[PDB]
Amino acid sequence: SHMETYNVELVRKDGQSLGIRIVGYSGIYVKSIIPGSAAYHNGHIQVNDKIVAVDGVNIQGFANHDVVEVLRNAGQVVHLTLVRRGGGWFLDI
Amino acid sequence: HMETYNVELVRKQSLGIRIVGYVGTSHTGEASGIYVKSIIPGSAAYHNGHIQVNDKIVAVDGVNIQGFANHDVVEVLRNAGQVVHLTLVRRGGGWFLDI
């Protein structure tokens, strides 16, 4: 059992979103990923990963409006740092 | 806050849930427990809509499974029938944004 920190580069076109629904509460988490999106095609993002940095900026402790502000300026290529809980046993039931 | 839900899943076949078990607290501060890691698209667990990723499963068919290791969970599931009753805990108070 452990924490994994990883970086992604997401590439999209003009007009396109990243393809991530975030949920805010403690931080921002990945709620869902739109199939066919930049986030889907990256292939490394999983539901419930915690987003801790966007485009070089550490967003931990940020209010909603401050999170919105860091993403507003996001371009065609967007860099995120995420944190994921790992280890634990698993079972397919 | 933390919301408790009872769910009733019906199958013929597996429920379509990957669960993960953690013995201790995360570096994020999140508790030990048995959590939904993923759900197979097209499964009974997906159908329900009533199961979400990171839901914490605390009971199965009248058995409190809190603190159970992998093998004890496996044994509980082996007794499960076509109608499986789960109690889950889910974090409420979420705000959402599509990005």
Do the Cβ atoms of A54 and A78 come closer than 8 Å?
Answer: yes
Which of A1, A70, A83 is the best substitution to test chain B (most B C-beta atoms within 10 A)? A1
A62: Cβ–Cβ under 8 A, 6 or more apart, which residues? A28, A70
Token pair in block for residue A22 = 């975030």
Q: Please give the single-letter amino acid code of residue B34.
A: I
> Cα distance from B87 to chain A (closest Cα, Å)?
15
Burial-class residue A1 by CB neighbours within 10 Å (0-12, 13-18, 19+). Answer: middle
Q: What is the DSSP code string of A19-85?
A: -EEEEE---EEEEEE-TTSHHHHH----TTPEEEEETTEE-TT--HHHHHHHHHT--SEEEEEEEEE
Among candidate residues B61, B64, B67, B96, the one with its CA nearest the CA of residue B82: B61
Which method was used? X-ray
Q: What is the DSSP code string of B48-81?
A: TS---TTPEEEEETTEE-TT--HHHHHHHHHT--
Contact A91 B53 (CB under 8 A): no
Using a CB-CB cut-off of 8 Å, the residues of chain A touching B18 are: 90-93
User: How far apart are alpha carbons A81 and A31 in whole angstroms?
Assistant: 16
CATH architecture of A1-93: Roll (2.30)
User: How far apart are alpha carbons B50 and B95 in whole angstroms?
Assistant: 18
C-alpha torsion sign, points A22, A35, A80, B38: positive
A38-77 residues touching B, CB cutoff 8 A: 47-48, 50, 64, 67-68, 71
| Residue whose pair of structure tokens reads 């396109």 in the numeric block | A16
User: How far apart are alpha carbons B99 and A68 in whole angstroms?
Assistant: 9
Q: Resolution, in Å, please?
A: 2.0
Among candidate residues B2, B3, B21, B23, the one with its CA nearest the CA of residue B76: B21
The CATH H-level superfamily of B1-99 is PDZ domain (2.30.42.10)
Taking the CA atoms of residue A88, residue A89, residue A92 and residue B3 in that order, the dihedral angle to the nearest 10 degrees is: -50
How many helices (H) does chain B have, and how many strands (E)? 2, 7
Contact A47 B38 (CB under 8 A): yes
B50: Cβ–Cβ under 8 A, 6 or more apart, which residues? B5, B7
User: How far apart are alpha carbons A84 and B13 in whole angstroms?
Assistant: 30
User: How far apart are alpha carbons A83 and A49 in whole angstroms?
Assistant: 6
Q: How far is CA A89 from CA A52, A82, B14, B84, in A?
A: 25, 21, 18, 22
C-alpha torsion sign, points A90, B69, A6, A20: positive
Radius of gyration from C-alpha coordinates of chain A: 14
